[PDB]
C-alpha cells in the first residue's frame, strides 16, 4: 500500500494507534503483521508555491481495517443541505499543501 | 511538442469580470488535475485554484472562495477561468500548471485591477 503523508502522520500509521487521519483514511488491524517503510521526499513531492496534488479525508460519519473509500460524498453534521455546499455540511477532502 | 498556451489576459477595472483560458496539447484534459497559481510581490508564489478528476470537486482558497469560476471544454481540452467581483488587491501574474511528468510551468499573464 503506497501513499504520501505528512511528518507527524508517520506515528499514526501503526496498528492500535489512534488518530483522526488514521481513523478516517487508513487504519491497520489490531492483529496486523507486517510494516511501514517511510522516506523523506522533500525534493520530489514539494514544489515552490505549494503542492496541492495530495488529498486526505477530513470529515466522515466506522471504517473496517483494509477498507477503501473512494467515494467523496458530502458529509452532513446535522436542516440538511441536500448535497449543496453551505451550512451544516463541508467538503470532506483537504489538501496538505 | 507538449505546451500550455494561455490567453484572455488584459486590464480590467474594479468590480469587473474576466475569462482566462489555458489550453494544453499532447494529452487530454481529464488525464491530470489542472492547477492555477498566482504570484504577487511579497513572500512567494501562492496557490489559488485546483480541480481534480472523477467529477468536479472544486476547491478554492478561503480568500477566493465563492467568487471564481472554473469550466472545462473537454471536446477541445481547454480550461476556462472566470474572475468575478475583482478587487485591486487581486493584481498578480497567473500560471496554469499541469503534470505529465516533470513539472510544467506556464508563462502566465499579468492582471491589474484599478
From Swiss-Prot, chain A:
Impact after mutating residue 47 to T: In strain: Omicron/BQ.1.1
Annotated phenotype, changing residue 48 to P: In strain: Omicron/XBB.1.5, Omicron/EG.5.1
Region annotated Immunodominant HLA epitope recognized by the CD8+, chain positions: 51-59
Receptor-binding motif: region residues: 40-97
Result for mutant: residue 49 to S: In strain: Omicron/BA.1, Omicron/BA.2.75, Omicron/XBB.1.5, Omicron/EG.5.1
Intrachain S-S bonds: 81-89
Region named Disordered: 58-91
Result after altering residue 55 to Q: In strain: Omicron/BA.2.12.1
Effect of residue 11 to S: In strain: Omicron/BA.2, Omicron/BA.2.12.1, Omicron/BA.2.75, Omicron/BA.4, Omicron/BA.5, Omicron/BQ.1.1, Omicron/XBB.1.5, Omicron/EG.5.1
Function: Attaches the virion to the cell membrane by interacting with host receptor, initiating the infection. The major receptor is host ACE2. When S2/S2' has been cleaved, binding to the receptor triggers direct fusion at the cell membrane. When S2/S2' has not been cleaved, binding to the receptor results in internalization of the virus by endocytosis using host TFRC and GRM2 and leading to fusion of the virion membrane with the host endosomal membrane. Alternatively, may use NRP1/NRP2 and integrin as entry receptors.
SUBUNIT field: Binds to host ACE2. RBD also interacts with the N-linked glycan on 'Asn-90' of ACE2. Cleavage of S generates a polybasic C-terminal sequence on S1 that binds to host Neuropilin-1 (NRP1) and Neuropilin-2 (NRP2) receptors. Interacts with host integrin alpha-5/beta-1 (ITGA5:ITGB1) and with ACE2 in complex with integrin alpha-5/beta-1 (ITGA5:ITGB1). May interact via cytoplasmic c-terminus with M protein. May interact (via N-terminus) with host bilirubin and biliverdin, thereby preventing antibody binding to the SARS-CoV-2 spike NTD via an allosteric mechanism.
Name the record gives this protein: Spike protein S1
The species this protein was found in: Severe acute respiratory syndrome coronavirus 2 (2019-nCoV)
Amino acid at each position: 500500500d503506497s501513499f504520501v503523508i505528512r511528518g507527524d502522520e508517520v506515528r499514526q500509521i501503526a496498528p492500535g494507534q489512534t488518530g483522526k487521519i488514521a481513523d478516517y483514511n487508513y487504519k491497520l488491524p489490531d492483529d496486523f503483521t507486517g510494516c511501514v517503510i517511510a522516506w523523506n521526499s522533500n525534493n520530489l513531492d514539494s514544489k515552490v508555491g505549494g503542492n496541492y496534488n495530495y488529498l486526505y479525508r477530513l470529515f466522515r460519519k466506522n471504517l473496517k481495517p483494509f477498507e477503501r473509500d473512494i467515494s467523496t460524498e458530502i458529509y452532513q453534521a446535522g436542516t440538511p443541505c441536500n448535497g449543496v455546499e453551505g451550512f451544516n455540511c463541508y467538503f470532506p477532502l483537504q489538501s496538505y499543501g | 511538442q507538449v505546451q500550455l498556451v494561455e490567453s484572455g489576459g488584459g486590464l480590467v477595472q474594479a468590480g469587473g469580470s474576466l475569462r482566462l483560458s489555458c489550453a494544453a496539447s499532447g494529452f487530454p484534459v481529464e488525464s491530470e488535475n489542472m492547477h492555477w497559481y498566482r504570484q504577487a510581490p511579497g513572500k512567494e508564489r501562492e496557490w489559488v485554484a485546483a480541480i481534480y478528476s472523477t467529477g468536479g470537486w472544486t476547491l478554492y482558497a478561503d480568500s477566493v472562495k465563492g467568487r471564481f469560476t472554473i469550466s472545462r471544454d473537454n471536446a477541445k481540452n481547454t480550461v476556462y477561468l472566470q474572475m468575478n467581483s475583482l478587487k485591486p488587491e487581486d493584481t498578480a501574474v497567473y500560471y496554469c500548471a499541469v503534470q505529465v511528468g516533470y513539472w510544467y510551468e506556464g508563462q502566465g499573464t499579468q492582471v491589474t485591477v484599478s
